[PDB]
């Protein structure tokens, strides 16, 4: 499978989530995603074929994970934008007020701005601390998907937010959306991962 930020992947032939970012760990290929997507060893599939299993995750508390993939996957320094792509250039954290976009299998590519840092999400499972808040919309399915600036700076992966009865926060005004993402920095250090860039 070609590994691109934003594309769909299923877990144990059940849940769906989105690919975050292609990364490496020595000779091991992987992608970073949201922890809530799977438990250690769940099987990840792309378009019906096995690609890898979850190597590690933390959820709740934090919301992060990395899937290690078989050698046959092709890692790419790109994030899906319709039929186009955003090249991953690095991971400089943008500040409050920066514009940002996110890519996911449910709502496609959405942009907005970062409105707050260090927010706690009270999920049914337990609190999730230190998330950054953006106002780009998202829907069930987007989780684990990429948050990136137009300039190609990777920000994090989609955790959650205030989904309305229609499964997203797209029908409510930007000012009322709270779309939360887990910062990429600490996921990269925690697991010793390197981002694939172009």
């Amino acid at each position: 499978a070609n590994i691109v930020g934003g594309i769909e992947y299923s877990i144990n032939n059940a849940s769906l989530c989105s690919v975050g970012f292609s990364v490496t760990r020595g000779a091991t290929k992987g992608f970073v995603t949201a922890g809530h997507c799977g438990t250690v060893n769940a099987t990840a599939r792309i378009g019906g074929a096995v690609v890898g299993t979850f190597a590690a995750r933390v959820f709740p508390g934090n919301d992060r994970a990395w899937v290690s993939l078989t050698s046959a996957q092709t890692l790419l320094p790109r994030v899906a934008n319709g039929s186009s792509f955003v090249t991953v250039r690095g991971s400089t954290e943008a500040a409050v007020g920066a514009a940002v976009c996110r890519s996911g299998r449910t709502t496609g590519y959405q942009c907005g701005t970062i409105t707050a840092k260090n927010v706690t999400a009270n999920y049914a499972e337990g609190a999730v601390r230190g998330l950054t808040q953006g106002n780009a919309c998202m829907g069930r399915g987007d989780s684990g998907g990429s948050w990136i600036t137009s300039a190609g700076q990777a920000q994090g992966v989609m955790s959650g937010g205030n989904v309305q009865s229609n499964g997203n926060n797209c029908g409510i005004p930007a000012s009322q959306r709270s779309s939360l993402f887990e910062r990429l920095q600490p996921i990269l250090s925690q697991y010793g991962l390197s981002l694939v860039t172009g």
Binding site: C17, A34, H36, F59, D63, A121, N122, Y123, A124, E125, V128, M138, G139, R140, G141, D142, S143, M158, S159, G160, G161, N162, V163, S178, L180
Partner: peptide, 4 residues
């Protein structure tokens, strides 16, 4: 808020 909910995860996703």
């Amino acid at each position: 808020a909910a995860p996703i």
